[PDB]
Design a protein around this ligand. Structure first.
Ligand SMILES: [Mg+2]
Ligand SMILES: [Mg+2]
Ligand SMILES: [Mg+2]
Ligand SMILES: [Mg+2]
Ligand SMILES: [Mg+2]
Ligand SMILES: [Mg+2]
Ligand SMILES: [Mg+2]
Ligand SMILES: [Mg+2]
Ligand SMILES: [Mg+2]
Ligand SMILES: [Mg+2]
Ligand SMILES: [Mg+2]
Ligand SMILES: [Mg+2]
Ligand SMILES: [Mg+2]
Ligand SMILES: [Mg+2]
Ligand SMILES: [Mg+2]
Lengths: 81, 129, 216, 96, 97, 25, 206, 121, 87
RNA sequence: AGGGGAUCGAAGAUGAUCAGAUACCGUCGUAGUCUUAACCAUAAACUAUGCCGACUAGGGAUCGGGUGGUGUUUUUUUAAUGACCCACUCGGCACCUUACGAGAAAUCAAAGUCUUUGGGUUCUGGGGGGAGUAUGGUCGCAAGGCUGAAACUUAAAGGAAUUG
C-alpha cells in the first residue's frame, strides 16, 4: 500500500504496535484497586509492580514481581482503575 | 548519531517519492523542517502537512504529490554570499528556470530568488526540485 | 510491398496515424521499421565503427563484425542500433533496422529567456551503461556541442545545437558511451517540470479509436 | 558520510590528509625530493655537453634484432658516464 | 571470487568451532565444515539374516543395528563419491535427495 | 616462489646480515 | 456509479459460498490483499465476497469496454480452468489460450499463435507467470483470479478467490461471462437468471 | 535400431488426421491406399509410412493417442464436454457454514438458509 | 512549455500516471491505460464512453496497481466499499 | 623458570617408493602438545565488507524476553505453574524470493537512498616490481614486532565474466 491515512490509524493496528512505535507514544500499563480478604483497606497497585506490595494493615502480600505484569495472589479481588 | 534532523526528513521524503507514496512520516519535526516544508508547499512541491504534537519533539505527516524530483540538504551549512548563490545554483540545480536553493538568512528561511529580491544572503540549508 | 502484420502497421498503412507523437504518447511497442521510415522519411543514418569480435573454437576463431549505427532526423528524434553479423554490410543493414526500431523523442529546451526556438536541452540529464556515465548540461547559445566526435554527431542527429557534456569511466568503450548518451537524452522526457505540472485529459488510444480498420 | 570529514571547522584535517596523499604521488614526490637535482646525470637541465669515450653496439630488446650504434660519453659538469644513442643511419661515422 | 555465500561451512555468529578428524585420513576439519553422514545399518548385511534367524536359539529376535556418525573432509567426501561436484545453479540446493 | 618461503628466506638473510654486521659493530 | 441493481444477490452469494470461493488461503497472506475479512480458525481466512463481486463487475465493465471481443484473451494453464476459459471463449469473443502458453505469443510477431490483445485474463498469476511477464512487454492490462497469497506483481485487476478449488474457478468464470453478457445486452434480463448452469464451466476427470 | 524419423511420423499422423475412416489395421491395404493417396518417391519410404500408420491405428484402437485429433475424435470431445448434470452441484441439497462466514453474510446484510458448524483448531 | 509569444513547442507533451503523477516515458512498455465503460439506466454499457486510467510500469511492477486502481475507482464512484484510506 | 610429561608429534632416526626422495606412505621418537609465574603482540586475527544514525520490497522460520487468547495437555478430573498451539511485539544469529535500486561483473536488503554527486566521523590506497627490502629509531631475553625509503627496472601486471 502506497496511499494510506497515517494520522488516523485503526485501533487494531495501534494496539498491535509497540508502545513506542505508535503515533504518539503512551503506556500500555494500568492501575488496579485491590482488596485482600480480611481488612477492607483498598489499595492501588501498578500492573508491573517490581515489589511485593502488601496492605498497610497487615503483611498480606497482594502481588509478586515478575518479568512483566505482577502476579496477583490467589485471595484477592481487583478492579481495573 | 542523529546529527541532522533536516537531513533525515529530506531523505525520508526522497525515498517516499521515489517509491511513489503520497505520504511520509517525519521525525522529529523541528522549526527549520517546518519552514523548509512551508517553502516547498508554497512552491507546490508537497501539499498539506500536519504536525502531530507529542510532548517530546513532534512528528510530521507530509502529503506527497508527484511533483518532487529531489529534495536535498547541504551539510555543512556553508556561509554563502551573493556571488556564491549563483555559482551554487549553477552547480547543483538542473536548470536556470526552475528549482530553488534554500538558504537561511537573517531575514528568515527562504529560497535564493527571494534572497536576491531582498538582497541578503546567509547560510545554505538545502535545495529542492 | 509491405503487407504489415500489426495493428499499428495496418493503421499507419491505412493512414490513420500520421505522426509518431501518438506512438510516443501511448508507448506503443513498434515492431516494424517500415512504420518508422513511413512516418519519418527524412532521417539519415550513420555507422560509427565496426569492431571485429571473435569466438574461440576448436578450429580457428569464428569472427564476426559488430556495427553500431545511429539513425536520426535533425529535430527531435534519434535511434541507436547495434548488430553483430558474419558480414559487415549485413551488420550495417540490420543495425539500421534496429536503430529505426529504437527511435525515441528528445525534449529540447532553453538555457535561458525562451526567446527563439529550443536550442539546447531542458535540464541536466545523465545516463549510464557499463562503467561509462555521460552527463549533458544545457549550454548557452552559440556554444556548440562540447563533446567527443561520436556523441557530438549523435546529438547533431538529435537536433541539439549546443550542450555541455561531462563523461566519466572508460569512454573508449564506444557502445557503452553511446548507449549512456542515448539513455541520457531519453531521460529528458522522464523529467517532470513545472510546465508539465498541469494535468491532461488522458486521450484514448488509436488502437481502440480505429479498432475496425485494425486487424479486422 | 563518505569517509572524509565534512564539518565547517575541519580544514586542517583535510589539508594534512591531502599533503600525505600528495606525497603518495610520483611527479610531486620527485619534484619535491629533487631527484633531478641529485640523482640525474643532467642535473635537471634539458641538454648537456660531454666528451665521447667510445662506441657501443648496443643490442635492441626482444622481439627485435638490431644493433643501435650508441656511444659512451663523459659529461663535462658532473664527470658522469652516460650512454647516448646516435640517431640516424651512418651518423656513427661523424662522432669518432 | 567468492564461490559460496556460506564460505563452504556453517558459521554465522561464532568465530571459532572446535574441529573433528576425518574418519578416512584423520585430517582436522572444523565441525561445521564437515560432511557428516549417519551410517545406520543392520549387523548381518541382509544376506545371512535367514541363516542367523534359523540358527538362533530364540524366535522373535530383534537383530539389532549398528549406528555410526561419519565425519568426512571435503577431499575424502569427493573421492569416495559421497558428495560430487554440482553445477553453479544447483550448488544452492540445500535439501537432501 | 611462494610468499611464505620468500619471507622465510629473507628472514634468514636478515639474521645473517645482523650477525655479520655485529661482527664489526 | 451504478443503479444498485448490480448488488450481490443472495442467489449469487449462495453460489459463491457453495463453491467455497470465500474460503481463501491459509494464514499465508500477501500484504497487498485487504480483501481479507475475519481470519478463521484452522488458520484459514475468509474473503469479502462483496468485494469479489465489486471487482468482478469492474472487470466486466473493462471487458465490455473492448471494441472487438476477440482482442480479449483468456489464459488457463490450470486443468481446473481450461474448460472454464473454453466456455468463456464460446460465450464471448475472447479467443482462448488454454494449456501451454507458448512464449513469443505477444512478442515475436512471426509466431503462428501471435496475438495482439488489448486485455488478458489469467487464472493463476503464479502458473501463468509467462503470460503476465509477456504482457509487461507490450502494454497490456492484466486481470487475474487471485488468491490471498498470489504474486500480484504486474496485476492490474485482482479478483480474490480460492483458486485451488475446482468449483470456484469455474464459478468465477461463469459469473464473469454472465455479467459481461449482461453489460453487452445479450442477456437483457438483468434480474432474471441465466439459462446456462454454472456446472458447465467445470473440470471433469475423463 | 528401428527408430523411425520425423518425416515418417509426420506423414503418418497427417494421413491419420485426414484419412482415418478410410484406412484400416492391415499393412497391405494401408500400403495400397497410401501409394494412391500420396506421392512418395520410394517404395521403402511408403512401406515405412504404412507400417507406422498401422501401428498408430493399433494405438488408436486402445485409447486416444496424443497429438492426433481427427474429426470423429474432436466431435466426440465436444459432445462430451457439453455435458451438464441434471441437478446443479451447487444447488442446496439440504448449506453448511462457519461462524466467520455467518458473520460475513450478516455484515453484508443478506439472509439465506445457512447451517453453522463449529470449526475448531 | 512554449516560447516567448504563445506558439507552443515541445512536441509530445507526455502522459502522467493516475497514481503517482509521474511521466510515462515513450518506451515504458509496462505502462497500461485502462478504459472502463460507463452504464446508463439500463445495465448496458455505452460504446465509446470510457473513464481512462494510466498506470506506470513502476507501480505496476511493484504490485500496487490493483490497490491504486481500487482507490481511483472508489474516488470516481464506480466502486463503493472496496478501498479503505485508514489501513 | 618450575611441575607434569598418557597420547600425538616440527627435528632426528629408520623401513619403503623413486632415476633420485634427508618428501608424500609405514614404525619409533626429542622439543612441544597440559599446567603455574612471566614474556612475545602476529594470522586467510575474514563477513577479505570501520563505527554511529535515519529511510527504503515481500516471505516464513528460529533464539531470548514480554502481552493476550473461555486454546491443548499434565497435576489435585479441575487450580497457579510448566511444556505446547495461535496472534502480536522488542532485540538477535541468520535464511528464501525478486530487483525499484546499485555494481565492471561475480553478486548485494546492503555493496541501495552516490554526476538528481554533502547525515556525523576514524583509518587506509594512487601502475607493476625493487620491497615491507636497506638504513635510522623504538619495543622485545631472543625469535622478531612497529615505523619505513631510495637507486634501478618495466608496459603492462591485475579483477570479473565469455567461447574454446
Ligand atoms: Mg578518465
Ligand atoms: Mg561545523
Ligand atoms: Mg612490446
Ligand atoms: Mg578458483
Ligand atoms: Mg578465527
Ligand atoms: Mg624425517
Ligand atoms: Mg596483519
Ligand atoms: Mg584485513
Ligand atoms: Mg545502518
Ligand atoms: Mg518471541
Ligand atoms: Mg525475531
Ligand atoms: Mg542471536
Ligand atoms: Mg597513481
Ligand atoms: Mg604503486
Ligand atoms: Mg580470472
Amino acid at each position: 500500500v502506497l496511499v494510506q491515512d497515517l494520522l488516523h490509524p485503526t485501533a487494531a493496528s495501534e494496539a498491535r504496535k509497540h508502545k513506542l512505535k505508535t503515533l504518539v507514544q503512551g503506556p500500555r500499563s494500568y492501575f488496579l484497586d485491590v482488596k485482600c480478604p480480611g481488612c477492607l483497606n483498598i489499595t492501588t497497585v501498578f500492573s508491573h509492580a517490581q515489589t511485593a506490595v502488601t496492605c498497610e494493615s497487615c503483611s498480606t502480600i497482594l502481588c509478586t514481581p515478575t518479568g512483566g505484569k505482577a502476579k496477583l495472589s490467589e485471595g484477592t479481588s481487583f478492579r481495573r482503575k | 548519531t542523529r546529527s541532522s534532523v533536516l537531513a533525515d526528513a529530506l531523505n525520508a521524503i526522497n525515498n517516499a517519492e521515489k517509491t511513489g507514496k503520497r505520504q511520509v512520516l517525519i521525525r522529529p519535526s523541528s522549526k527549520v523542517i517546518i519552514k523548509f516544508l512551508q517553502v516547498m508547499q508554497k512552491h507546490g512541491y508537497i501539499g498539506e502537512f500536519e504536525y502531530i504534537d507529542d510532548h517530546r519533539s513532534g512528528k510530521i505527516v507530509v502529503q506527497l504529490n508527484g511533483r518532487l524530483n529531489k529534495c536535498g540538504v547541504i551539510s555543512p551549512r556553508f556561509n554563502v554570499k551573493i556571488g556564491d548563490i549563483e555559482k551554487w545554483t549553477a552547480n547543483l540545480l538542473p536548470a536556470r528556470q526552475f528549482g530553488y536553493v534554500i538558504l537561511t538568512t537573517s531575514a528568515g528561511i527562504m529560497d535564493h530568488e527571494e534572497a536576491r529580491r531582498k538582497h541578503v544572503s546567509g547560510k545554505i540549508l538545502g535545495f529542492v526540485y | 510491398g509491405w503487407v504489415p502484420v500489426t495493428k499499428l502497421g495496418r493503421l499507419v498503412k491505412a493512414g490513420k496515424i500520421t505522426t509518431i507523437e501518438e506512438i510516443f504518447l501511448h508507448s506503443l511497442p513498434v515492431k516494424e521499421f517500415q512504420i518508422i521510415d513511413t512516418l519519418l522519411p527524412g532521417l539519415q543514418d550513420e555507422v560509427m565503427n565496426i569492431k571485429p569480435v571473435q569466438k574461440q573454437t576448436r578450429a580457428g576463431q569464428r569472427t564476426r563484425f559488430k556495427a553500431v549505427v545511429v539513425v536520426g532526423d535533425s529535430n527531435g528524434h534519434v535511434g541507436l542500433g547495434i548488430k553483430t553479423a558474419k558480414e559487415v554490410a549485413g551488420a550495417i543493414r540490420a543495425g539500421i533496422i534496429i536503430a529505426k526500431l529504437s527511435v525515441i523523442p528528445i525534449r529540447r529546451g532553453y538555457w535561458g529567456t525562451n526567446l527563439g526556438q529550443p536550442h539546447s536541452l531542458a535540464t541536466k540529464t545523465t545516463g549510464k551503461c557499463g562503467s561509462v556515465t555521460v552527463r549533458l548540461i544545457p549550454a548557452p547559445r552559440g556554444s556548440g556541442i562540447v563533446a567527443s566526435p561520436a556523441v557530438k554527431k549523435l546529438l547533431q542527429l538529435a537536433g541539439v545545437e549546443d550542450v555541455y557534456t561531462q563523461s566519466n569511466g572508460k569512454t573508449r568503450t564506444l557502445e557503452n558511451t553511446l548507449k549512456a548518451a542515448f539513455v541520457a537524452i531519453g531521460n529528458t522526457y522522464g523529467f517532470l517540470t513545472p510546465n508539465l505540472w498541469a494535468e491532461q485529459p488522458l486521450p484514448v488510444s488509436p488502437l481502440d479509436i480505429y479498432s475496425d480498420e485494425a486487424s479486422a | 558520510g563518505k569517509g572524509k570529514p565534512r564539518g565547517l571547522n575541519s580544514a586542517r584535517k583535510l589539508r594534512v590528509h591531502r599533503r600525505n596523499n600528495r606525497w603518495a604521488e610520483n611527479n610531486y614526490k620527485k619534484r619535491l625530493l629533487g631527484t633531478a637535482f641529485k640523482s640525474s646525470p643532467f642535473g635537471g637541465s634539458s641538454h648537456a655537453k660531454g666528451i665521447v669515450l667510445e662506441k657501443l653496439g648496443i643490442e635492441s630488446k626482444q622481439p627485435n634484432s638490431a644493433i643501435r650504434k650508441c656511444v659512451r660519453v663523459q659529461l663535462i659538469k658532473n664527470g658522469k658516464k652516460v650512454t647516448a644513442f646516435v640517431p640516424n643511419d651512418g651518423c656513427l661515422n661523424f662522432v669518432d | 571470487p567468492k564461490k559460496r555465500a556460506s564460505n563452504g561451512r556453517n558459521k554465522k555468529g561464532r568465530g571459532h568451532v572446535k574441529p573433528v578428524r576425518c574418519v578416512n585420513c584423520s585430517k582436522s576439519i572444523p565441525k561445521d565444515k564437515a560432511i557428516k553422514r549417519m551410517a545406520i545399518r543392520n549387523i548381518v548385511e541382509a544376506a545371512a539374516v535367514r541363516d542367523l534367524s534359523e540358527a538362533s536359539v530364540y524366535p522373535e529376535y530383534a537383530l539389532p543395528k549398528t549406528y555410526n556418525k561419519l565425519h568426512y573432509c571435503v577431499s575424502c567426501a569427493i573421492h569416495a563419491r559421497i558428495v560430487r561436484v554440482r553445477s553453479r545453479e544447483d550448488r544452492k540446493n540445500r535439501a537432501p535427495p | 616462489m611462494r610468499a611464505k618461503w620468500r619471507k622465510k628466506r629473507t628472514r634468514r638473510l636478515k639474521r645473517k646480515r645482523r650477525k655479520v654486521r655485529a661482527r664489526s659493530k | 456509479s451504478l443503479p444498485a441493481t448490480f448488488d450481490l444477490t443472495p442467489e449469487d452469494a449462495q453460489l459463491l459460498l457453495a463453491a467455497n470461493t470465500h474460503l481463501g488461503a491459509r494464514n499465508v497472506q500477501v500484504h497487498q490483499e485487504p480483501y481479507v475479512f475475519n481470519a478463521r480458525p484452522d488458520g484459514v481466512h475468509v474473503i469479502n465476497v462483496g468485494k469479489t463481486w465489486e471487482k468482478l463487475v469492474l472487470a466486466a465493465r473493462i471487458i465490455a469496454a473492448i471494441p472487438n471481443p476477440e482482442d480479449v484473451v483468456a489464459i488457463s494453464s490450470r486443468t481446473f480452468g481450461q474448460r472454464a476459459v473454453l466456455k468463456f471463449a464460446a460465450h464471448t469473443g475472447a479467443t482462448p489460450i488454454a494449456g501451454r502458453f507458448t512464449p513469443g505469443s505477444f512478442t515475436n510477431y512471426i509466431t503462428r499463435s501471435f496475438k495482439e490483445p488489448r486485455l488478458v485474463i489469467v487464472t493463476d498469476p503464479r502458473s501463468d507467470a509467462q503470460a503476465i511477464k509477456e504482457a509487461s512487454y507490450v502494454n497490456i492490462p492484466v486481470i487475474a483470479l487471485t488468491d490471498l497469497d498470489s504474486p500480484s506483481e504486474f496485476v492490474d485487476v485482482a479478483i480474490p478467490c480460492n483458486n485451488r478449488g475446482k468449483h470456484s474457478i469455474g464459478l468465477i468464470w461463469y459469473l464473469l461471462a454472465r455479467e459481461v453478457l449482461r453489460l453487452r445486452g445479450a442477456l437483457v434480463d438483468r434480474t432474471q437468471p441465466w439459462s446456462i448452469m454454472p456446472d458447465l464451466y467445470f473440470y471433469r476427470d475423463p | 535400431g528401428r527408430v523411425r524419423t520425423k518425416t515418417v511420423k509426420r506423414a503418418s499422423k497427417a494421413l491419420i488426421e485426414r484419412y482415418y475412416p478410410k484406412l484400416t489395421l492391415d499393412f497391405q491395404t494401408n500400403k495400397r491406399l497410401c501409394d494412391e493417396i500420396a506421392t512418395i518417391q520410394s517404395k521403402r519410404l511408403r512401406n515405412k509410412i504404412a507400417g507406422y500408420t498401422t501401428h498408430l491405428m493399433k494405438r488408436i484402437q486402445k485409447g486416444p493417442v496424443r497429438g492426433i485429433s481427427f474429426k470423429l475424435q474432436e466431435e466426440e470431445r465436444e459432445r462430451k464436454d457439453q455435458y451438464v448434470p441434471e441437478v446443479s452441484a451447487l444447488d442446496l441439497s439440504r448449506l453448511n457454514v462457519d461462524n466467520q462466514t455467518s458473520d460475513l453474510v450478516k455484515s453484508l446484510g443478506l439472509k439465506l438458509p445457512l447451517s453453522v458448524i463449529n470449526v475448531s483448531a | 512549455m512554449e516560447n516567448d509569444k504563445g506558439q507552443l513547442v515541445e512536441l509530445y507533451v507526455p502522459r502522467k500516471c493516475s497514481a503517482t503523477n509521474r511521466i510515462i516515458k515513450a518506451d515504458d512498455h509496462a505502462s497500461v491505460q485502462i478504459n472502463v465503460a460507463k452504464v446508463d439506466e439500463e445495465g448496458r454499457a455505452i460504446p465509446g464512453e470510457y473513464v481512462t486510467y494510466a498506470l506506470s510500469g513502476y507501480v505496476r511492477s511493484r504490485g500496487e496497481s490493483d490497490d491504486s486502481l481500487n482507490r481511483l475507482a472508489q474516488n470516481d464512484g464506480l466502486l463503493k466499499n472496496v478501498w479503505s484510506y485508514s489501513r
